């Protein structure tokens, strides 16, 4: 019943919280990444203050500030959320917000994934068709079936190799 209380805080791998550069020498990152910094300065500032052996009053205030901090990272909003100082008053998407898809993410979840051999178009009726067939743009098929096609191109004299066969098509 002590493992409920945290003393070693694990930290999400960096890639799923990236720090990518976008346009005009400006970057984009996660709230998680800014939720951790504010935590550390406080644990780190505690190590100073405790080392210093400062008065208890202040040794406290920093721990209050450290509970407040770990809270807002694990589950930010269960005590009146913190925000990206200026910018706007948007609360920071915390590991909790993230898992349960708190902000229209669980509604986005059920909008499913995306699939890599797919396509879409308008439908025109096909009377001449038989029950188990459909009229499909060859145009469409040759995207969709591309890799399957490249081989037959290699099997036939249409290409020397696949890179040339793919090249034949771009």
């Amino acid at each position: 019943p002590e493992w409920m209380i945290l003393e070693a805080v694990p930290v999400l791998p960096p890639d799923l919280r990236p720090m990518v550069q976008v346009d005009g020498g400006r970057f984009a990152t996660s709230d998680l990444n800014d939720l951790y910094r504010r935590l550390i300065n406080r644990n780190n500032r505690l190590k100073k203050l405790l080392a210093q052996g400062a008065p208890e009053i202040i040794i406290r205030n920093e721990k209050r500030m450290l509970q407040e901090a770990v809270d807002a990272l694990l589950d930010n909003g269960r005590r009146g959320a913190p925000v990206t100082n200026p910018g706007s008053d948007r609360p920071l998407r915390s590991l909790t917000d993230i898992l349960s898809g708190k902000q229209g993410r669980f509604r986005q979840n059920l909008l499913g994934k995306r699939v890599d051999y797919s396509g879409r178009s308008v439908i025109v009726v096909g009377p001449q068709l038989k029950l188990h067939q459909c009229g499909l743009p060859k145009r469409m098929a040759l995207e969709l079936f591309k890799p399957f096609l490249l081989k037959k191109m290699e099997e036939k004299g249409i290409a020397p190799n696949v890179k040339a066969a793919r090249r034949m098509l771009e």
Partner: peptide, 13 residues
């Protein structure tokens, strides 16, 4: 049990 939460400021002061 909700009378006040954002005490950290007031509490210290």
């Amino acid at each position: 049990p909700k009378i006040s939460t954002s005490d950290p400021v007031r509490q210290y002061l």
